[PDB]
C-alpha cells in the first residue's frame, strides 16, 4: 500500500511543483518513476533509507528528499513542458520487488491561452436497437478541450457504474496538424431496454477537467478555463 | 550499459489463444529479471520474478516466463488467455551493484479480442437528448476491424468492447460522427460487412 | 576438499557511520581484508599469491564494500526497532557466508547466517531453502525472507560465483 500526492496537478512553464509519497510500510527503498508512451518507465531518483538520496537515469530538472523512511518527495522547482508526464512512487523491501502508487498526472503548459474546457452532451437510445437487440445504448461525448487531462464516469441514479461501460483509452486530436490542437473523447453505456424505459431512471456523464488554479491570472474576457466538472443528462422514457 | 528491448509495443490475442510477449535485455553479468503488469487506469504490480535456479518461473494465474542465459531473454507465456488479462506488461532488469535499480522495458499493450458467439452487426444514428446527431457501430464480431474516416472531415472511434456483468454479455462498439448537417449511416465506407 | 568464507561485521556509532570490516577465508586461512578507518580505506591482499591481480579487480570489489556500510548502518537501526532498544546503543551486526566444495568441483555445503550483538540470529539450513530462527524478532525476518524467496537470491552467489572464484583463487600451486 503506497500512496502518493497530488493525484492531479496543472502548472505552467516556470512553476514549482512538489509530489509526495508516503509508505506506511517498513520499506527502506523508495522510488520515483515516470511513465510515457513511447519510452515506458524511466527512473528519476531513489533513496535507501531516511535522508539518503541516490541518482536515477533521468534526474534532470528533478530533485528528491527522503524526510522519513515513509516519506519521499519529488521536487520540481522549475517546470518545463518536457516534464509533462504520469508519475509513480514505489517502495521495496526486496531487490526488484516493487509496490506502486496510483500515479500522479502532471500537465505543464506553454501558454494558458491554448486552454479550453470540454463541452459534454449525451445522446439517447433508439426505438431501433430496443426493437432489435431488446437493449439500449448511450453515448457521452467530450470535445474541444486542451490539454488532455480529464476523467469520465457514468452515474446512474446516484451510482458510479463500471459495468456495461466502454470508454476510450486515449482521446484523439481535433487538428493533429496544428499540434496546439484540442482533444476529443467518447464513452458508451449499455443497458436493458426496460431500464431505459423507466422515466424514473436518470443517466449521467460527468467529466472532470483539471485546469487553472483559483488565483491564476486570467487575461481574457473569456470564461476562465478552470478545474471543473462538466456533465450532461438524459432521462428514461416509456413511450 | 543496461537497456531493455521489447519488440512489439502492440499485440492482439483471442481468448484461450497462446500468447508470447518478448523481452531481450542488455548483456552481463548476473542480471535480475522481472515481469510487471499495469492495469487500466492503475499503476504497476509485480507479476513474476527470477533470481536463480530453474530457468522457468511459473505464475499462479497461468503466466510463466523462461530465462535463457544463451539467448539472453526473459519471455512471458500464457497457454490460455482470458479477457481479464487485458493490460500493459513491463519486463524489468537489474544487475549486481545495481540490485535496487531497475531498468524498465518499453512496455507492451495487450488487447484480448473478445469471443462473442452471436454477432449481429448493425449501425444506428443517435439523436441528442436536448437537441431534437451521432452514428454508432456495435454488436459486430471481434474479427472485423474498425476503419478510419475516409472523409477525414468526419470522426470515427475504433472498436470498444463493453460488457454487461449482470447477464454475462460482451460487446464491441464503434462510433462515427461529424458537425456536417448532411449525414447517413451508410456512408462506414471501409472494412464493411454487408450483413 | 575445500572451503570459502566471508565475515562482514559492523558496530554502530551513537548519534556517525560505523566501523566495517570484511575478511576472506580460504581453507580456513585469511587471504583478504577490508577496513573503514585506515586512511586509505580499501581492500588489501593479506597473502602473497593474491598480489597477482590487476587493480581494476581490487577497485571493483572495493566498490562492493561501500554498499555494506549503508546496508549495515540501515539494518542496525532496524534491529534496534524490533527489540525496542534505545538510540544511544552501540551494537554489532555480523554476516557470515560461503560454501564448501568437493575434490571433484561440486558443491557440498553453503553458508549464510547472521548474528546480532554476538549471538546467533538467523541461519540458512542445509536444504538451502529454509531458515532456522533464533528469537521471536527473528521470525519476522524469516517471515519476510521465506515468502519472498530469500534463498533463491542467495543461491546465485553460492551456486555460481562462490565455486568459480574459489577455483580461481586456488589456481596458485
Amino acid at each position: 500500500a503506497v500512496t502518493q500526492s497530488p493525484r492531479n496537478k496543472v502548472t505552467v512553464t516556470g512553476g514549482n511543483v512538489t509530489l509526495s509519497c508516503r509508505q506506511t510500510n517498513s520499506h527502506n527503498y523508495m522510488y520515483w518513476y515516470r511513465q510515457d508512451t513511447g519510452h515506458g518507465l524511466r527512473l528519476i531518483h531513489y533513496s535507501y533509507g531516511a535522508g539518503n538520496l541516490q541518482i536515477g537515469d533521468v534526474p534532470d530538472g528533478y530533485k528528491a528528499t527522503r524526510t522519513t523512511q515513509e516519506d519521499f518527495f519529488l521536487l520540481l522547482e522549475l517546470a518545463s513542458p518536457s516534464q509533462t508526464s504520469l508519475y509513480f512512487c514505489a517502495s521495496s523491501d526486496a531487490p526488484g520487488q516493487l509496490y506502486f502508487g496510483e500515479g500522479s498526472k502532471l500537465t505543464v503548459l506553454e501558454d494558458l491561452k491554448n486552454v479550453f474546457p470540454p463541452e459534454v452532451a449525451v445522446f439517447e437510445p433508439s426505438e431501433a436497437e430496443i426493437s432489435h437487440t431488446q437493449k439500449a445504448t448511450l453515448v457521452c461525448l467530450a470535445t474541444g478541450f486542451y490539454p488532455d487531462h480529464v476523467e469520465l464516469s457514468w452515474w446512474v441514479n446516484g451510482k458510479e457504474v463500471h459495468s456495461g461501460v466502454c470508454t476510450d483509452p486515449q482521446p484523439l486530436k481535433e487538428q493533429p496538424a496544428l499540434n496546439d490542437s484540442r482533444y476529443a473523447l467518447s464513452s458508451r453505456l449499455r443497458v436493458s431496454a426496460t431500464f431505459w424505459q423507466n422515466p424514473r431512471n436518470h443517466f449521467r456523464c460527468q467529466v472532470q477537467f483539471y485546469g487553472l488554479s483559483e488565483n491564476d491570472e486570467w487575461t481574457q474576457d473569456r470564461a476562465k478555463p478552470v478545474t471543473q466538472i462538466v456533465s450532461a443528462e438524459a432521462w428514461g422514457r416509456a413511450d | 550499459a543496461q537497456s531493455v528491448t521489447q519488440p512489439d509495443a502492440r499485440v492482439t490475442v483471442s481468448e484461450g489463444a497462446s500468447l508470447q510477449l518478448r523481452c531481450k535485455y542488455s548483456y552481463s553479468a548476473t542480471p535480475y529479471l522481472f515481469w510487471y503488469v499495469q492495469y487500466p487506469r492503475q499503476g504497476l504490480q509485480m507479476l513474476l520474478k527470477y533470481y536463480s535456479g530453474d530457468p522457468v518461473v511459473q505464475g499462479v494465474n497461468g503466466f510463466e516466463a523462461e530465462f535463457s542465459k544463451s539467448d539472453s531473454s526473459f519471455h512471458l507465456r500464457k497457454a490460455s488467455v482470458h479477457w481479464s488479462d487485458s493490460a500493459v506488461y513491463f519486463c524489468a532488469v537489474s544487475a549486481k551493484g545495481t540490485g535496487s535499480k531497475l531498468s524498465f522495458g518499453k512496455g507492451a499493450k495487450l488487447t484480448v479480442s473478445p469471443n462473442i458467439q452471436n454477432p449481429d452487426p448493425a449501425v444506428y444514428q443517435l439523436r441528442d437528448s436536448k437537441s431534437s446527431s451521432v452514428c454508432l457501430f456495435t454488436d459486430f464480431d471481434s474479427q472485423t476491424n474498425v476503419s478510419q474516416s475516409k472523409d477525414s472531415d468526419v470522426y470515427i472511434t475504433d472498436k470498444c468492447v463493453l460488457d454487461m456483468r449482470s447477464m454475462d454479455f460482451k460487446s464491441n462498439s464503434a462510433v462515427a460522427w461529424s458537425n456536417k448537417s448532411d449525414f447517413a449511416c451508410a456512408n462506414f465506407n471501409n472494412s464493411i460487412i454487408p450483413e | 576438499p575445500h572451503s570459502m568464507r566471508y565475515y562482514e561485521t559492523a558496530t554502530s556509532r551513537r548519534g556517525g557511520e560505523p566501523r566495517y570490516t570484511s575478511v576472506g577465508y580460504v581453507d580456513d586461512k585469511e587471504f583478504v581484508r577490508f577496513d573503514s578507518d585506515a586512511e586509505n580505506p580499501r581492500y588489501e591482499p593479506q597473502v602473497p599469491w593474491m598480489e597477482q591481480e590487476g587493480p581494476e579487480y581490487w577497485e571493483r570489489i572495493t566498490q562492493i564494500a561501500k554498499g555494506q556500510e549503508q546496508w549495515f548502518r540501515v539494518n542496525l537501526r532496524t534491529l534496534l526497532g524490533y527489540y525496542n532498544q534505545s538510540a544511544g546503543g552501540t551494537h554489532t551486526l555480523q554476516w557470515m557466508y560461503g560454501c564448501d566444495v568437493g575434490s571433484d568441483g561440486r558443491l557440498l555445503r553453503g553458508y549464510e547466517q547472521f548474528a546480532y550483538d554476538g549471538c546467533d540470529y538467523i541461519a540458512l539450513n542445509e536444504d538451502l531453502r529454509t531458515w532456522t530462527a533464533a528469537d521471536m524478532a527473528a521470525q519476522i525476518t524469516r517471515r519476510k525472507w521465506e515468502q519472498a524467496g530469500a534463498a533463491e537470491y542467495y543461491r546465485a552467489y553460492l551456486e555460481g560465483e562462490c565455486v568459480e572464484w574459489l577455483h580461481r583463487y586456488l589456481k596458485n600451486g
Binding site: - | - | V74, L79, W145
Partner: peptide
C-alpha cells in the same frame, strides 16, 4: 569474491 548487498530485514 564478496557477495553483494543482502536483503532488508
Amino acid at each position: 569474491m564478496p557477495a553483494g548487498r543482502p536483503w532488508d530485514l
